[PDB]
Motif scaffolding. Structure first.
Motif, PDB file in Angstrom:
ATOM      1  N   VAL A 145       0.832  -1.200   0.000  1.00 33.65           N
ATOM      2  CA  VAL A 145       0.000   0.000   0.000  1.00 33.65           C
ATOM      3  C   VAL A 145       0.868   1.252   0.000  1.00 33.65           C
ATOM      4  CG1 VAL A 145      -1.723   1.295   1.289  1.00 33.65           C
ATOM      5  CG2 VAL A 145      -1.937  -1.182   1.073  1.00 33.65           C
TER       6      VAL A 145
ATOM      7  N   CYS B 105      -5.616   0.172  -4.027  1.00 33.20           N
ATOM      8  CA  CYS B 105      -5.633  -1.256  -4.326  1.00 33.20           C
ATOM      9  C   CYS B 105      -6.526  -1.560  -5.522  1.00 33.20           C
ATOM     10  CB  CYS B 105      -6.100  -2.047  -3.104  1.00 33.20           C
ATOM     11  SG  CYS B 105      -4.995  -1.954  -1.680  1.00 33.20           S
TER      12      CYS B 105
ATOM     13  N   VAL C  98      -1.939  -7.757  -4.303  1.00 32.30           N
ATOM     14  CA  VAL C  98      -2.804  -6.585  -4.206  1.00 32.30           C
ATOM     15  C   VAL C  98      -4.140  -6.959  -3.579  1.00 32.30           C
ATOM     16  CG1 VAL C  98      -3.757  -4.633  -5.473  1.00 32.30           C
ATOM     17  CG2 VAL C  98      -1.643  -5.705  -6.254  1.00 32.30           C
TER      18      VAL C  98
ATOM     19  N   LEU D 291      -5.890  -5.271  -0.183  1.00 27.94           N
ATOM     20  CA  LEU D 291      -7.250  -4.766  -0.023  1.00 27.94           C
ATOM     21  C   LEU D 291      -7.937  -5.407   1.176  1.00 27.94           C
ATOM     22  CD1 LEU D 291      -9.432  -2.920  -1.092  1.00 27.94           C
ATOM     23  CD2 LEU D 291     -10.181  -4.764  -2.613  1.00 27.94           C
TER      24      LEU D 291
END
Ligand SMILES: C[C@]12CC[C@@H]3c4ccc(O)cc4CC[C@H]3[C@@H]1CC[C@@H]2O
Ligand SMILES: C[C@]12CC[C@@H]3c4ccc(O)cc4CC[C@H]3[C@@H]1CC[C@@H]2O
Lengths: 232, 230
Positions: free
Chosen positions: A9, A139, A164, A168
């Motif tokens: 992130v 994301c 990814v 999230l």
């Protein structure tokens, strides 16, 4: 390790493209000029989208065919996803650029964009109702880049998409809501990807109609950007 | 209120019956497009009964029902095709008596692109080992999520119910909590791929109408005009 949730992130946050500054023309909006200020803005953002994509961990490790595949299939979707995030807190308007804010009815001067404008505003409103976070958007945008290619080196792309995805899930887990609420939000967020893709195809089907009417030169804006710009 | 265990069982009995096309002589561009559009017309009749058997759909306003059907009917036809073809790579099982190999598309201009999209999305479901219960939830979710814009609040409840059913199905498989989110995410990301196929497969049907290969474009509207009520 670089694909760690908290770290990915932060990498996605530091990969965000700079704000593109385009302004309104002096003369009132005609069909030719509005379709021109939008494709000019899109061309500038596509230059930064290449740098953004190349900055997502593992993307440069993919094959050249896969990189072109992912970009060719997602660029319009990524342009719309960023537009909805800039318009998430301004109902009834589309924040294409800080000095280029278009109200809904302003699309009455070009044929057929109001249908596309209403799709973008509607999906933007749903992201407002879900109270889309900034890190969910980071994301989701990266997921769009990695998932939009259909493929009608393969092991590395699947690992990035899962990374990814873990990011999230990790961002939603920071909200502290119930496990059932965490799955619901994840589902509500990803079900909107179909609406973004639908807008991607429809807004692009409209761009082909503009090339056939000689309102815009070319249809593939990513191809046009790459053909016109030079390597340093 | 229906439990997730009970909603999935209701979707099962709502499944449409199988339809036959039985046809034809080798394939031409017009003969194949005739068989596929004729097959869809027959399936669209059963889709109306299927949708009305989804719990709560009949409680939605008449405007909502038509809005959802107009938006998803191609997706639902394609999702049903993908399920029928999930265990046979390189082949599209449109109907029982109509199993097309991938290369057979070459006779219709631009159909190979749509076929490869349908086959590739079908391959992703096969690699995910898509369960029967997951298929029933996903296909219902396509109907209830297709629309873009008192009856509106009821629609959000129905989509929450089918989503909870899907989460329940995944949870009952006993996989890790991280694997449950991974599987839910992979399933719902494929909804976008179904939409891309629906938009492109319909862009293609429009080009077949301007080329005068097929008479009508909106197959759902053509069905409702031609068929009579009992
Ligand atoms: C693609 C269009 C021009 C470029 C527009 C644009 C341009 C820049 C941007 O950041 C987002 C969007 C989304 C809507 C797009 C439009 C929808 C129809 C039109 O052809
Ligand atoms: C929509 C097309 C005709 C109808 C076809 C059909 C027809 C019946 C069905 O159950 C599924 C599909 C998916 C593919 C569709 C085709 C893709 C392109 C073509 O126009």
């Amino acid at each position: 390790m670089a694909l760690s949730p908290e770290q990915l992130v932060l990498t996605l946050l530091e990969a965000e493209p700079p704000h593109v500054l385009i302004s309104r023309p002096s003369a009132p909006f005609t069909e030719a000029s509005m379709m021109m200020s939008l494709t000019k803005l899109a061309d500038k953002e596509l230059v930064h989208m290449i740098s953004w994509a190349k900055k997502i961990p593992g993307f440069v490790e993919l094959s050249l065919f896969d990189q072109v595949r992912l970009l060719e299939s997602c660029w319009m979707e990524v342009l719309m996803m960023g537009l909805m995030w800039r318009s998430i807190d301004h109902p009834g308007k589309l924040i294409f650029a800080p000095d280029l804010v278009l109200d809904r009815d302003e699309g009455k001067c070009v044929e057929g964009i109001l249908e596309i404008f209403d799709m973008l505003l509607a999906t933007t409103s749903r992201f407002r109702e879900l109270k889309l976070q900034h890190k969910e958007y980071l994301c989701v945008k990266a997921m769009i880049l990695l998932n939009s290619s259909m493929y009608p080196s393969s092991r590395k792309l699947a690992h990035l998409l899962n990374a990814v995805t873990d990011a999230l899930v990790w961002v939603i887990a920071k909200s502290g809501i119930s496990s059932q609420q965490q799955s619901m939000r994840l589902a509500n967020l990803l079900m909107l990807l179909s609406h973004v893709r639908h807008a991607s195809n429809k807004g692009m089907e409209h761009l082909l109609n503009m090339k056939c009417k000689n309102v815009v030169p070319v249809y593939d804006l990513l191809l046009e950007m790459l053909n016109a710009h030079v390597l340093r």
